[PDB]
Each structure stands twice: as structure tokens, then as C-alpha cells.
DNA sequence: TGATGACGCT
DNA sequence: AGCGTCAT
């Protein structure tokens, strides 16, 4: 009826860097540019663990979480860049700093929510209203949308041909007369995101993709539809067809046990199928919150706000100790707690200088031969010896060894600074 | 054979 | 508070 909310109130984008760590390394080392290449951590174990892959290497079947020695079997000419190691562990500072470059650029356009090291949500509703005012109600030219795909359109034989036919159908259909058409608002949003992505590339060298829609889940889904170096507009109207063959697990938060249970309990495969169930039925199976969430989401509606948050809320350091490397002496545990604590102290001091805040809680987490114990103590001083001494103090009792020895051995250590306050 | 980070439940 | 889920 005239009172059925359609979840078209906002314009939300999700901007995600293409093969991010790989681009960081390629910018640094021009010999890696436009080549099959990957970023690896820890060279000794099977050439190291692949944690990022260029699109060129992806064409050979190289993936994340593959051992480099194995990746080389698929791609003999694969080039590799190694993650920095400091104090005996992988150190991700280069990637965090590149991340800050990008986030700082996006923050000029609109308030952002840092969703991860290489992606951010953007609420463009106000920016769109304003840009709609700045225009004299002039039509939107395709030239303003050079890398934009309109999902579901068109309805030639080469990719760019298709892209342009879809875009032309979209723009030809557009009611630029009313400033309150959600489709018009999304289109202006897409123009702004073209501008943002251009500024990111110009000012960092980094390419990215984006999704533009009415909420975060649709924006995120849209982003991945046409990668790399392209952006995708998913309109409200596109949702029934898009979801009609969209596996449940592709939607953010449904990739795990809950999505599996949706599939198993309801006996469905695709997002669209969820529409067959009453809100009450879905709530009965998956709980009040999840139920309402699913009922709205399968109709393309979601209300989770883009949160005004550009900085991580926690600062952490962890190290696994697999197999025979598991820690078995107290001196070992103490030494590694110290390495972790020294990295953490460096990052915390930098953080306090840049961001005018101080962490107040230290979380210590271990695994014994995914977390054997998690204990918190006060963080009152940015001092590595104190933090590691305190960590030790709070995991001390875990040692079942009556004997200078640690039993069972520890296969993971984790230090996390949390509960920031202004300073 | 990894290193992170946000948020939900009780 | 501690533990779990989901994700990059
Ligand atoms: N399990 C993972 C996933 C990602 N990353 C790091 C390396 C990635 O380069 C960066 C961003 O991850 P994405 O999942 O966005 O993947 P990419 O940016 O590498 O590729 P795409 O272009 O597919 O987004 O985070 C990681 O360390 N461990
Ligand atoms: Ca990415
Ligand atoms: Ca990402």
C-alpha cells in the first residue's frame, strides 16, 4: 500500500581496494606492476602463506591461503612480495599506513565507516541532495559515469559494450524531474563515487571498486559484482531478479553457520526464496533480531547505519606457534609476550600521538595445544615490559606443569589494547 | 602452520 | 566479563 516502506531513504556506497596488499607492494616496486604476483608472509614454510593475489595471478588459479610453493605449481612465473618481519613476527604497518591514505581521502567526501583495512562504507544521502541542488536539473550524461555498471541492464559482444548499453538504458529511463526519485538519487551517488575513486587513484596510485545502493548489504554485494576497477549500481528495482538466483551465503553475515541453518531448516537455496515466509516464521527459526533482519533483507531493505568511525576500536598483536614450535618454557612465553608487547607499545604510542586517545584495557588471549583463555587487566602505561609482565601475571595459572616448563604448550599468544578514552 | 578486527550472547 | 561468530 501507501505505507509499505521500501528501504530507499538512503544512498550508501561501499568502496573496496582491488587486491590491496598487492597494489601497496606494486606501487612500491614498479617491477611487480601488471604482473602475476602475490603477497606472502613467512618464507620458510612452503615458500610462505599467500595473503593477497593480483588479478593476473588469479587467472592462473592462484588464491588466498595457498602456500607459495603450491602457487608456483600453477603459476611458475609468479612474482612475490614478502610481508615485513620485525621482532620475529609479521608486521603489517605498511598496509595500515596505506589504508590511512585511502580513508583520509574518502573522508573529504562524506563521513565514513571503516569496515576493514581496505574498505569503507559511505553515507552519501546529504552529498546527493546537495549535488541535486547544485545542478540546474540538468540531465546526467554517461560521461559522468565512465566505470559504472547498472545491475540488471541491458535488458554487444564485448564487456564495455554491454556496460554502455545498460547505462544508456538506465539514463534514458531516468526521471530527472523529481529530486526525490530514489533511482535518480542512486545515480547522483554513483557520479560522486566516480569522483571519489578518481581522487583515490590520482592521489595514491591505488585502484578500487565500489557498490552503490540504498543500504550497506546491497552496497557490499554490488561492489563485488564487477571487479576490478569498476563500480556497480544496484537499484531497489533490481533486487527481485538479482536475489532470485543469489545463493544465501553471498550476503554479508550469512556466509557462516546462520546461513547454513537458513538453507537447511527452510530447504531453500537463494535469497529471494526467503520472501515466502512470514516475519513471524523467520523469527521462530532464527530469533527475533535475525528474523526481522532476514524478512526485510530478502526484500532489499536494511537499516543498519553507516557508523561515523574512521579509526579501529582495538589495537592488537598475535602470533601462532604451530606444531613443534609451540611454547614449552616460561622463558619462551615471556620472551614472546615481550616481542608482542613491544610491537603493541610502538603502535599505541603512534596512535596516541595521531589520534588523541589512550587505551585503558589490555586483553590477553592464549591457545593451548581457538582460544584457551582470555583475561583482561588494566592498561595504565604504554610500556612493553609492564604490559608483558601483566599479561604473564594474568595467564600464569594456566600452566598445569608442576615443574621452568609450560604445560600444555601454547600455540597462540594475543595482546589487544581496547577501551580507548580521549586524551 | 596467519594476522588481524567488529560485534552478539549470557 | 569471557566466549563465540563472521569477516578481511
Ligand atoms: N583472509 C584475509 C583476507 C584479506 N587480507 C588482507 C589482504 C588483502 O589484500 C586485504 C583486503 O582483503 P580483500 O578480502 O578485500 O581482498 P583483496 O583486496 O586482496 O582482493 P579483492 O580485489 O578481491 O578485494 O586484506 C588478509 O590478510 N587475510
Ligand atoms: Ca579488496
Ligand atoms: Ca575488503
Its domain, for residue A5, covers: 1-18+89-247
Residue A15 pairs in a beta bridge with A120, A210
In this structure, are A217 and A102 located in the same domain? yes
d(CA A251, CA A25): 30
d(CA A38, CA A18): 13
Cα–Cα distances in angstroms (integers) from residue A378 to residues A173, A359, A362, A381, in the given order? 60, 9, 6, 9
Out of A15, A17, A39, A119, give the residue to mutate to test ligand 1, the one with the largest number of ligand atoms within 8 Å of its CB. A17
Q: How was this structure determined?
A: X-ray
Cα–Cα distances in angstroms (integers) from residue A212 to residues A153, A187, A296, in the given order? 15, 9, 19
Strand B footprint, Cβ within 7 Å: A 41-42, 45, 49, 51, 65, 67, 89-92, 96, 117, 287, 289-290, 307, 309, 312-320, 322-325, 343, 412, 416
In this structure, are A134 and A219 located in the same domain? yes
The Å distance, CA of A319 to C1' of B9, is 27
Contact by Cβ (8 Å): A286, A248: no
The Å distance, CA of A366 to C1' of C8, is 22
The Å distance, CA of A44 to C1' of B1, is 11
Query: In the listed set A57, A88, A119, which residue is the last one of a domain according to the structure?
Result: A88
CA of A361 to the centre of ligand 2 (A): 31
* Maximum CA extent, chain A: 81
Cα–Cα distances in angstroms (integers) from residue A231 to residues A13, A169, A209, A241, A392, in the given order? 10, 17, 5, 19, 49
d(CA A41, CA A160): 37
Q: Are strands A327-329 and A405-422 parallel, antiparallel or unpaired?
A: antiparallel
Angle subtended at Cα A214 by Cα A130 and Cα A96, rounded to the nearest 5 degrees: 85
In this structure, are A273 and A391 located in the same domain? no
In this structure, are A293 and A371 located in the same domain? no
- Look at chain A and report how many structural domains it folds into: 4
In this structure, are A220 and A189 located in the same domain? yes
Contact by Cβ (8 Å): A300, A217: no
The dihedral sign for the CA sequence A223, A227, A229, A233: negative
* Atom from ligand 1 closest to the CA of residue A227: 22
Which residue, among A94, A40, A99, A42, has the nearest Cα to A64 in the 3D structure?
A40
d(CA A363, CA A415): 6
Contact by Cβ (8 Å): A151, A222: yes
For A19, the grid coordinates are 587486491
Q: Whose CA is nearest to atom 14 of ligand 1?
A: A19
Is it true that the peptide bond before A154 is cis, omega within 30 degrees of 0?
yes
d(CA A42, CA A83): 8
The Å distance, CA of A136 to C1' of B5, is 44
In this structure, are A254 and A374 located in the same domain? no
In this structure, are A301 and A313 located in the same domain? no
Sequence-distant (≥ 6) Cβ neighbours of residue A260 within 8 angstroms = A249
CA of A79 to the centre of ligand 1 (A): 18
Q: Which of A25, A56, A113, A119 is catalytic?
A: A119
Phi, psi of A44 (to 5 degrees): -65, -35
CA of A119 to the centre of ligand 2 (A): 7
Which residue, among A368, A378, A352, has the nearest Cα to A409 in the 3D structure?
A368
CA of A208 to the centre of ligand 3 (A): 10
In this structure, are A295 and A312 located in the same domain? no
d(CA A49, CA A67): 5
Strand C footprint, Cβ within 7 Å: A 16, 115-119, 252-259, 370-371, 373-376
Sequence-distant (≥ 6) Cβ neighbours of residue A51 within 8 angstroms = A21, A39, A40, A41, A64, A65, A83
Which residues are near ligand 1 (CB < 6 Å)? A 16-21, 51-52, 64, 117-118, 227-228
d(CA A127, CA A134): 10
Q: Are strands A79-82 and A89-90 parallel, antiparallel or unpaired?
A: unpaired
Contact by Cβ (8 Å): A218, A243: no
In this structure, are A82 and A179 located in the same domain? no
* C-alpha dihedral, A238 to A242 to A244 to A246, nearest 10°: -160
Query: In the listed set A305, A335, A353, which residue is the last one of a domain according to the structure?
Result: A305
* Atom from ligand 1 closest to the CA of residue A117: 25
Query: In the listed set A223, A247, A271, which residue is the last one of a domain according to the structure?
Result: A247
d(CA A165, CA A146): 12
The CATH number given to whatever domain includes residue A38 is: 3.40.1170.60
Chain B: bases < 7 Å from a protein Cβ: 1-9
Is A85 one of the catalytic residues? no
Cα–Cα distances in angstroms (integers) from residue A104 to residues A97, A130, A258, in the given order? 11, 22, 35
Which nucleotide in the DNA or RNA is closest to residue A394, CA to C1'?
C2
For A53, the grid coordinates are 593475489
Angle subtended at Cα A96 by Cα A34 and Cα A33, rounded to the nearest 5 degrees: 10
d(CA A24, CA A11): 30
The Å distance, CA of A140 to C1' of C1, is 54
Contact by Cβ (8 Å): A415, A387: yes
Q: Given strand A112-116, what is the order of strands in its sheet?
A: A112-116, A119-123, A12-17, A208-213, A231-233, A148-150
Resolution in A: 2.0
d(CA A358, CA A378): 12
CA of A52 to the centre of ligand 2 (A): 9
The CATH number given to whatever domain includes residue A295 is: 1.10.150.20
The CATH number given to whatever domain includes residue A313 is: 3.30.1490.100
Amino acid at each position: 500500500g501507501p505505507h509499505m516502506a521500501t528501504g530507499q531513504d538512503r544512498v550508501v556506497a561501499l568502496v573496496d581496494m582491488d587486491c590491496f596488499f598487492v597494489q601497496v607492494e606494486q606501487r612500491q616496486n614498479p617491477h611487480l606492476r601488471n604482473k602475476p604476483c602475490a603477497v606472502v608472509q613467512y618464507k620458510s614454510w612452503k615458500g610462505g602463506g599467500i595473503i593477497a593475489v593480483s588479478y593476473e595471478a588469479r587467472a592462473f588459479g592462484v588464491t588466498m591461503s595457498m602456500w607459495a610453493d603450491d602457487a608456483k605449481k600453477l603459476c611458475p612465473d609468479l612474482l612475490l612480495a614478502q610481508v615485513r618481519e620485525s621482532r620475529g613476527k609479521a608486521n603489517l604497518t605498511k598496509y595500515r599506513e596505506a589504508s590511512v591514505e585511502v580513508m583520509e581521502i574518502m573522508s573529504r567526501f562524506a563521513v565514513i565507516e571503516r569496515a576493514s583495512i581496505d574498505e569503507a562504507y559511505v553515507d552519501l544521502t546529504s552529498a546527493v541532495q546537495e549535488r541535486l541542488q547544485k545542478l540546474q536539473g540538468q540531465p546526467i550524461s554517461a560521461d559522468l559515469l565512465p566505470s559504472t555498471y547498472i545491475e540488471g541492464l541491458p535488458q554487444t559482444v564485448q564487456k564495455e559494450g554491454m556496460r554502455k548499453q545498460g547505462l544508456f538504458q538506465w539514463l534514458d529511463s531516468l526521471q530527472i524531474d523529481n529530486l526525490t526519485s530514489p533511482d535518480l538519487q542512486l545515480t547522483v551517488g554513483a557520479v560522486i563515487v566516480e569522483e571519489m575513486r578518481a581522487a583515490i587513484e590520482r592521489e595514491t596510485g591505488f585502484q578500487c571498486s565500489a557498490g552503490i545502493s540504498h543500504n550497506k548489504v546491497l552496497a557490499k554485494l554490488a561492489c563485488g559484482l564487477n571487479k576490478p576497477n569498476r563500480q556497480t549500481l544496484v537499484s531497489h528495482g533490481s533486487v527481485p531478479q538479482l536475489f532470485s538466483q543469489m545463493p544465501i551465503r553471498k550476503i554479508r553475515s550469512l556466509g557462516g553457520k546462520l546461513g547454513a541453518s537458513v538453507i537447511e531448516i527452510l530447504g531453500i537455496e537463494y535469497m529471494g526464496e526467503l520472501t515466502q515466509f512470514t516475519e513471524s516464521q523467520l523469527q521462530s527459526h532464527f530469533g527475533e533480531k535475525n528474523g526481522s533482519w532476514l524478512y526485510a533483507m530478502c526484500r532489499g531493505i536494511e537499516h543498519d547505519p553507516v557508523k561515523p568511525r574512521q579509526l579501529p576500536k582495538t589495537i592488537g598483536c598475535s602470533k601462532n606457534f604451530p606444531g613443534k614450535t609451540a611454547l614449552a618454557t616460561r622463558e619462551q612465553v615471556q620472551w614472546w609476550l615481550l616481542q608482542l608487547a613491544q610491537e603493541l607499545e610502538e603502535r599505541l604510542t603512534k596512535d596516541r600521538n595521531d589520534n588523541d586517545r589512550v587505551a585503558t584495557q589490555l586483553v590477553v588471549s592464549i591457545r593451548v595445544q581457538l582460544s584457551s583463555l582470555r583475561r583482561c587487566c588494566a592498561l595504565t602505561r604504554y610500556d612493553a615490559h609492564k604490559m608483558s609482565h601483566d599479561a604473564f601475571t594474568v595467564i600464569k595459572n594456566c600452566n598445569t606443569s608442576g615443574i621452568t616448563e609450560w604445560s600444555p604448550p601454547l600455540t597462540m599468544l594475543f595482546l589487544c589494547a581496547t577501551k580507548f578514552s580521549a586524551s
